[model samples]
Target: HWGYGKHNGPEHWHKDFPIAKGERQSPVDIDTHTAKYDPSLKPLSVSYDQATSLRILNNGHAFNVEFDDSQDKAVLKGGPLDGTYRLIQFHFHWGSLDGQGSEHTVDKKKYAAELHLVHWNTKYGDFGKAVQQPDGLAVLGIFLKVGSAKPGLQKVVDVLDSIKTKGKSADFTNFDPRGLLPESLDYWTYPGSLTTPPLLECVTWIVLKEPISVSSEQVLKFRKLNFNGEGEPEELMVDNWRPAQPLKNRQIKASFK
Candidate 1:
């Protein structure tokens, strides 16, 4: 039911999916041209123990990880970010065409892909209700590019064969989500909302400046996912990325110091 290509892509996702009307939509172009609005924001920090309970889930469209928040030690703390946020779902965005792939654009430049770590504030009880609140969500954005083959991501790519069949998810337990995080914690943050359906306006966006690298073959595997039924041989769901939207008077803050 989703459409791809110009005119029918991201810009029009809201028409078929009304939740896109929310104040925040991701994939915004980030660049020097963007006014240095807030240089005071600080980076959010998490403990090693909390990062360990992360479990990966193949949610049809993409591979997302679900963190065990029930364990009190997994709480995200410190910096400009407040409230005890529980890690929820994490997913990725990629491209169908070679030249373009990233979800968030920087000065019109695109990377190979983008990863999102979604979290919900404990004050809101659960993710279902938290997403409805104005400040109940926190998402960490990381960019990935096709470069020298990386052994770090092999753990993820190795499982591709298992999930090759649509709607099939195997138990990906014992994997650390931290392994996927960039070495430098330095990041850019802003107030935004979910880029997908039921787009909520209650999210704090923390986008990492440093990007991770993957191989061209790895990128090709992601492109193989299809939204169409397995029976339809001609249905090829090549790319599933949303376009960058207007910033709408919002200011992005960076944590360099």
Candidate 2:
């Protein structure tokens, strides 16, 4: 019971997945002004090879661009990381309306959309096992706004037509996920869990303060996605995001003052 619908929306997820509303649940409201200034925190170190983005697939819930994480071809280090983290997949959460799709909010303000680049710690054996433990995952959250056209985003939009329906996938490569990030590496770090089910409290959230721009046309393109299979009645993919949770006494540590 977890989808963007009246019967299975984010509000109803806890019916089946008890942790859906857990204390450490993700997509939390980030109050940058109140974040603790960590003077010693190093600048975020991020690296990823376009070639490592092996393929893209539509898994009904969302479209995921997967990577070949067997090695550290695409990796992230520094900035609140406990060990080397490998990029495993990247996905988006959007809304039917322009101003409400993003998961994480800044001072209670929402963005057009949100991008999640999910990674795992190699010291924890594998991603499957890592997600079950606290601090075993590191996620990068990038916000999107409507403005100038984003060339890198256009590449992703082009592939969407092929995966409009559920269970569709295509070979996607040579497209670096970093191309869509903002120029600034400054960020706010926090402890949180996955926004989606299984809702593991294992993520070291490193959310960028700068938002990358995309065209209004590009924003609408994501609304064309469907939550149902090709032959099934169409359930357009929109509002595929969880609302920001309470801070619950947790401190949001900033990488910059």
Candidate 3:
């Protein structure tokens, strides 16, 4: 049973499948007070063209954008992270109810949403193979706060009507995720696992302290995602985000001096 029904939440995840209990989870509470400064860590700089080829995917619960390493031909240069990392899949985490939605919390404040930019080490040939390596994944986490208005997210909001049905996807072309990013690249880095199922512990997370704002109406549009079949009556798919997990003694580092 897919943890979508009764008695199938996180507490009972491993009852039928014992291995689920041992898997590393995410959307953990980020205690900035415990974070230390790392001089070796640096900022990641990416260009606009490199950010445009992201392929949008609606995988039932939430929307995801996968990057084509071969098509985009994007390259990562400079920073302490000096290497040609290939862009992979990116996704988001949101809440069912208002007030809380973000994955990472700073000083106990939760934003409206969180966007993740998943990349992989190109040294391993391709993204599929790179995912097998422990240090292959690099995820950039961007937070979204509720505010007046935002035009940058229109590309994503516009297609909500088509993908309103669960598992339905619309062809989104010429969209750029860079527009969703905050002005400051300054962030916090840590070794973490995928927040979703099949929780892979191969991710290097870089969460931005600052957040971008979007209108309340835009937030409501995302809440309209449905769980029912395309032709059937639509049911709300809000509360797709996972609850915060334990840190387990892992030390988080910050990019700021």
- Pairs that collide in candidate 1 are 27-244
lDDT of 1: 0.70
Which candidate, 2 or 3, would have the higher TM-score against the true structure?
2
Candidates arranged by TM-score, highest first: 2, 3, 1
In terms of lDDT, the poorest run of 10 residues in model 2 is 45-54
**Model 1 TM-score (2 dp):** 0.87
Candidate 1 least-lDDT 10 residues:
228-237
lDDT of 1 at 217: 85
Instruction: Kindly list the per-residue Cα lDDT of model 2 for residues 1-257, writing each as its tens digit.
Output: 46779888888888888887677778888887889899988888898753388788988888999999998888888998868888999999988888889999998999999999999999987999989888789999999988998888788899999999989999997778878889999999988999988788899999999999999999898899899998899999989998988778688999887
> What is the lDDT of every predicted structure here?
0.70, 0.88, 0.70
How does each model score on TM-score? Answer: 0.87, 0.97, 0.88
User: lDDT at 183 for candidate 2?
Assistant: 94
lDDT of 3 by residue, 1-257 (tens): 44343555556655654534443446567788888888887667765475555456667667876566674455453343546666666777777655787877777777788888787777778776766766777778888888866787887887788877756666766677677878888888777766665566767777888888888888888888775667887657666666677777678788786
Candidate 3: 10-residue stretch with minimal lDDT: 71-80
Model 2 TM-score (2 dp): 0.97
Q: How many clashes does each candidate structure show, in the order listed? A: 1, 0, 1
